[PDB]
Design a protein around this ligand. Sequence first.
Ligand code: CLA
Ligand code: CLA
Ligand code: CLA
Ligand SMILES: CC1=C(/C=C/C(C)=C/C=C/C(C)=C/C=C/C=C(C)/C=C/C=C(C)/C=C/C2=C(C)CCCC2(C)C)C(C)(C)CCC1
Ligand SMILES: CC1=C(/C=C/C(C)=C/C=C/C(C)=C\C=C\C=C(C)\C=C\C=C(C)\C=C\C2=C(C)CCCC2(C)C)C(C)(C)CCC1
Ligand SMILES: CC1=C(C/C=C(\C)CCC[C@H](C)CCC[C@H](C)CCCC(C)C)C(=O)c2ccccc2C1=O
Lengths: 733, 154, 33, 80, 159, 95, 143
Amino acid sequence: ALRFPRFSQGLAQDPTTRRIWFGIATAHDFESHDDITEERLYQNIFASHFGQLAIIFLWTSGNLFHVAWQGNFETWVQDPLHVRPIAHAIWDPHFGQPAVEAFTRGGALGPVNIAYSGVYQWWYTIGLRTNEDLYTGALFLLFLSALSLIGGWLHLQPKWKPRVSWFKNAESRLNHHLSGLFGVSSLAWTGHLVHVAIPASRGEYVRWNNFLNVLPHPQGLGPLFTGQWNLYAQNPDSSSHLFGTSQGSGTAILTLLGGFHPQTQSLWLTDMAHHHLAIAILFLIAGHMYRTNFGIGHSIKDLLEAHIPPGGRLGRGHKGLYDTINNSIHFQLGLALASLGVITSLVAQHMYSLPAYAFIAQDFTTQAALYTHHQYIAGFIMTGAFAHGAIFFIRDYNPEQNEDNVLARMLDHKEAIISHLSWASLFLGFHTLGLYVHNDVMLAFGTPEKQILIEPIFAQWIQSAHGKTSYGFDVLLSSTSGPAFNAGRSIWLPGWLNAINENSNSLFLTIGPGDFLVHHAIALGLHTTTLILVKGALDARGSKLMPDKKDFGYSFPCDGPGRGGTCDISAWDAFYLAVFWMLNTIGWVTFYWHWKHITLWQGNVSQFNESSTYLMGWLRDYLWLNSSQLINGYNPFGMNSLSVWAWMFLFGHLVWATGFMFLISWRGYWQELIETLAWAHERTPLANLIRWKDKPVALSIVQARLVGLAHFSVGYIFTYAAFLIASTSGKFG
Amino acid sequence: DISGLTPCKDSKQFAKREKQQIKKLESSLKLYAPESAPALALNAQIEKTKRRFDNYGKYGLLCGSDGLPHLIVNGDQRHWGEFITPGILFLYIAGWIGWVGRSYLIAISGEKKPAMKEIIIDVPLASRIIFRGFIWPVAAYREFLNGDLIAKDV
Amino acid sequence: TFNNLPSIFVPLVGLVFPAIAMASLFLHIQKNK
Amino acid sequence: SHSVKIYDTCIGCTQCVRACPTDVLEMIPWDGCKAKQIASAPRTEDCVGCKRCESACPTDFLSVRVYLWHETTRSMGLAY
Amino acid sequence: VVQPINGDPFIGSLETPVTSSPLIAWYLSNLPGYRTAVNPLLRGVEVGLAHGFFLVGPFVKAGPLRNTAYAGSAGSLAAAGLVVILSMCLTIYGISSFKEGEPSIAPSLTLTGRKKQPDQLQTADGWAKFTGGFFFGGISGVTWAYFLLYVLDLPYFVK
Amino acid sequence: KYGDKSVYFDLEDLGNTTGQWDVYGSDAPSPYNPLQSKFFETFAAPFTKRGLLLKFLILGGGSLLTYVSANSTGDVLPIKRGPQEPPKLGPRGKL
Amino acid sequence: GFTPPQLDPNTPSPIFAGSTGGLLRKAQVEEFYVITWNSPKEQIFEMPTGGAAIMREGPNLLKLARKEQCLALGTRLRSKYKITYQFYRVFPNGEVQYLHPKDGVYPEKANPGREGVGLNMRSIGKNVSPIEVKFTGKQSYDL
Ligand code: CLA
Ligand code: CLA
Ligand code: CLA
Ligand SMILES: CC1=C(/C=C/C(C)=C/C=C/C(C)=C/C=C/C=C(C)/C=C/C=C(C)/C=C/C2=C(C)CCCC2(C)C)C(C)(C)CCC1
Ligand SMILES: CC1=C(/C=C/C(C)=C/C=C/C(C)=C\C=C\C=C(C)\C=C\C=C(C)\C=C\C2=C(C)CCCC2(C)C)C(C)(C)CCC1
Ligand SMILES: CC1=C(C/C=C(\C)CCC[C@H](C)CCC[C@H](C)CCCC(C)C)C(=O)c2ccccc2C1=O
């Protein structure tokens, strides 16, 4: 490698300008780099993870630093319900004085941006009641970033260079990560919540100078060693507690009273403490499972070779799977992104319903921004999980070493899987679109009594199976005589019932036929994204149209116009079209969320329950109506604080349309156009003196696909962020 | 009275929907003479609406707070007219379509060029088969037991 | 001075770090050994 | 540049090269078929990757096969 | 007179009246972009002076402070900044296109077929001298445009 | 020979064949005055080392930019002038 | 060692009023693929660079842009006009590489004297998976 890509001499030996793009895009595809090994692969991955941790700690330190320096956090602590958060100040020298005047919020002497990230609520719930606290945290996270950087530097040096036999130690790694990185980590978080966050909620500030003296509980560790743990749940902040002062506070540190804090409409800090403690016990116990240097424990290899069902249904079972996962980094990455995306969606689905931060339920833009954020993140992470499974099936899947096992016996009936997922998506799309269209028509014919309104009896049954008496099923928690209600009758169910039955909060919302129909739209989206991704992953090795697809790799443009045509045949293109369907699905999810919640917050749940059953309600009563205060962010006569969100709205529209250029138009019209341009530049006087060094070419097909999707997704995300933030901030209900 | 839904025969908002649609159609009725074709058609649509609302009342449909009939699919015996009886009515016709189509494709499978029979549909053959899907729930069951429903790989 | 750090770091970063970075990276592109 | 390969399932019909617009291919004698000839790909440096060769290969899947690889000025088909 | 370039029909250009004519070719041949034998420093000086005035034009009257009293001064300041950036990009161009000491990549031939000397502008030191001339000439033209807007404001248009 | 009747492939003179021509690159001597040329030579030879020129350009330009933006007041850019206006209370109180 | 190259001389070129699809700077620093053919009469043919040219009676010579241009031209010549053609590659240093038949015979007639390369003696499904050649320069198809 001679030119800029030092990691691929095939792109360095490219006189065109494709090598710049492909040296950007393959920079982090180490197992495709030239003249490397498995040692160097894992070591570069390890140093890269160090860099990622450094960036994460640096970005958190930037958040803390800007909230401390340019924020109003000390003012937000006093009157949080009526003082606006501040992400960071703004020095944009293009600003006009109306814009300097409009962006001055939260009691600031200059322009500012309102923190729609909820970091204020989460820092205030865990202590951190001064700017100096955030400054110390930011400086410590900067130290941690430098620590990660030096660690990743030295672990690249030959003296500290772990071998592949160390990375593949999938039992010591699992034991350590489970026990320490989850159990001890959540245990330390409890040791913060018990020593700092609860005392900071109960009044007194417990800081590094005085945290050894302050007893978290008036009887310190006697109750714990003597087994009398119930002494830690004696005075559980009996319903009159003001978060941040001793009025109506107590002395408990670990409780299971459940439900919400009445002031904050959030979860109790004692519940979080006991929670992280209990799951710490579970993870510290589970991290002593796998065999290590001490003679006891399990070998995952024999756990998999033992889970082969007699009967040959699964065939060879999980035999040879430890070796095909531990050697395959893409399999580890795919499983990891699967779990991560599911738990990210879980974070969203449980932070909207069970907010664990003070005064985040009552503020309404952060609760939407976070949900939308984590759900789009989960959709991307899930698409990536499947894409890396496809990359595994091409690159690291050895069909001989896992013959007739659960994963080759999987690839056998790929046609069955693809066909039945196709059936599910076809069925759902047909039917639910038909019902939305029937209702659109029945409203268009002035006959809303003829609409197909299916009450979601099953979700309403689960709701009534948790204590919601809004339907009258009276089963397993709404029935007082049920043994499930009798078991936890004295533990959590009073708080949980006065929470779930309270129709102001956002857990277990009262759902109706529109919720049914949009849940089926969601199922269509999930099944279809899954179809696209699974089909790409299983046809990654080959199909009837291109059986030697494993030899062309994961990302290749096509196979030519022969055999009828092979546009978008690669598993990369399955990922591609799945990102489209994923954005669509998460858009449905977040549209449903934002409309249900903005109608709840405004008070008119009837708006959703009547208008969500026909698509013109979404186009009128959600998009057209809630975009009223946004697009008026800057009129011909003046502007307001929502000018930035309107500009971002239109910016996202613009790139979302620009992506259609790279998607609709493909390579050949642009190559010819660039040939004309090159002629003109080489025959235009006073510019003949200037000659390019990289011969200009139109973007490669796979590249331009990626670029179109980048513009498309950036526009999707920025547009909906603008709209969501501006609609929920233009009113705050 | 299930799922918190009042029946439509004893709902207030349902009758309000009725009254509102009738007043809407009557506001468009005071512009023509009461014996001409437009007024007669409007009165026919009015009776259509009134009988529609009364029929949705008398069938025991459940009208929610919005005052529109919410169909119950869970399997309640009172609400099998919502999904399960028309669901069987569907699946009987849908399997008719599939079974006559399948027996047609199997009928032309032993042809020299079968594809021309998918373009130029052999109407005598199909018409002799078009009623053979009346008995699909039993013929298909036997073809599944005999092994003739699902093909073998070879 | 803390209010004057915007007057020093933003023109520093968003103009010089592109100068340094894009220049050094163009040199790294146009290199030969 | 591109890596063109001819597999033994060939029938020596001479459509790959007669379709190939850049003289990449050439028929050589062989003993594996009734026609006693098979295609070879010496001039892969001149291979643009247009896959006209394998859009004219009449076999089960293919015998000629073009693998996209290091793209140079002549495989990218540049007059500049 | 649209016959091809040098009568060569398979070269991608033509000797139309716009390209190859006694007036327009002369004009394109006696200006500092195409004065090959002369050293590139004077060429760059001329180029930078001209473009410094051309840039100070649409910064005083067209800009964020055009209507204020800081129109001319701050506009000339922005023009000098754009000139510094243009010398910057010219500099990275000279560094990236040719390294240190290679011969000139310019054509050593001409339309008449004379094996002329290559344009030393395209060399490293030559392009560096050209960039230095461009920067010097451009800052000088910016300040001279500011001077003419200062002392001779009345003949020029204000609007 | 390139000058024959419709011959454009002189294999010896590949420059005339491939089109290597200074289409307007006059080899005419310096039309400038010698004294001003020497003046510019002596006053721009500092900008002869492209690497030192680049370092000087980047560092001095960033320094001048920071100096302008730090010493400039709010009269020349409103972002420094500040609000000079009371802050509006947002919706729902301020939240 | 049976067919020598032809070493195209200073032949005349076709009558053509000049186009813009001709030789750009690629010829001035890289090859430009001269083609030579021999006409029975002064007839008119479409040029691959766009436009109509009038080939001369006898030998002709065209330096167009690249290999595909001259080979497309030569295929149109051989099919439409039934004429022998041969084209070259002219690097800027001076060398002239002979390329189209490379045996005096077009690359359809399997004439012995040409060694088979790009030749995998197997069916196309019997190539190894990438994992079998992971961390090796051989991708999937060179064993
Ligand atoms: C107990 C000992 C121990 C501990 C603590 C760690 C810790 C870590 N290792 Mg491991 N490692 C160990 C032993 C240990 N290692 C051993 C013995 C080996 C031998 C093979 C390895 C081999 C190894 C490799 C090969 C790699 C690591 C990596 C990592 C890092 C993971 C990335 C990260 O920070 O996410 C940590 C994530 C969590 C703590 C939680 C995630 C999920 C929870 C459940 C989500 C929900 C709660 C959420 C956090 C709440 C947020 C709310 C709010 C505060 C925002 C982390 C620092 C990676 C790394 O970065 O390299 C340095 C890596 O590539 N380790
Ligand atoms: C509104 C836009 C839209 C719609 C309707 C669809 C529809 C579909 N896509 Mg998606 N798709 C879209 C945009 C869209 N896509 C975009 C922008 C991309 C990015 C390239 C993709 C990428 C994509 C992939 C990659 C995949 C799909 C799949 C599917 C099918 C999923 C099965 C399903 O729900 O079908 C139910 C049927 C419909 C939704 C069709 C609606 C039309 C009605 C029912 C037809 C009847 C009307 C009328 C009587 C007909 C006569 C009309 C006229 C001639 C008179 C379905 C046809 C998947 C698939 O094929 O799975 C089977 C699949 O793998 N699509
Ligand atoms: C003889 C007709 C016939 C039969 C028995 C089947 C049977 C099947 N199809 Mg296929 N299919 C057909 C026609 C048929 N298909 C046609 C014409 C199309 C083009 C629209 C499709 C497109 C299609 C897709 C895209 C998918 C299936 C799927 C399926 C399976 C699930 C059933 C389902 O969801 O319905 C699917 C039905 C439709 C999508 C609507 C089209 C059906 C038409 C209306 C019936 C045509 C009848 C024929 C013209 C009448 C001739 C009568 C003769 C006497 C002359 C099943 C094996 C799914 C699968 O494999 O999952 C297991 C799946 O993903 N089918
Ligand atoms: C391609 C591929 C891949 C990837 C893939 C993916 C990405 C997947 C995903 C997947 C997913 C993403 C999944 C999910 C799942 C889920 C589940 C399976 C669930 C379950 C559940 C349950 C069981 C529950 C239970 C319960 C309840 C109900 C509640 C309460 C509690 C309890 C517990 C009782 C891999 C790499 C692997 C390999 C290769 C191939
Ligand atoms: C009761 C009900 C329900 C539920 C149900 C269920 C859950 C079911 C399931 C079912 C299932 C789970 C099924 C499965 C199946 C499977 C299979 C595997 C089949 C096969 C078949 C076939 C193969 C056929 C064929 C045919 C026919 C017969 C028709 C036409 C033609 C054809 C040939 C297509 C609910 C509550 C919702 C509602 C109400 C009703
Ligand atoms: C418009 C278009 C072009 C023309 C695009 C050109 C050649 C490239 C873009 C032009 C410049 C380079 C804009 C660059 C914009 C960004 C600033 C670059 C960001 C990259 C940095 C982060 C490195 C194509 O080449 C193309 C190719 C294949 C399918 C569709 C299309 C297509 O739709």
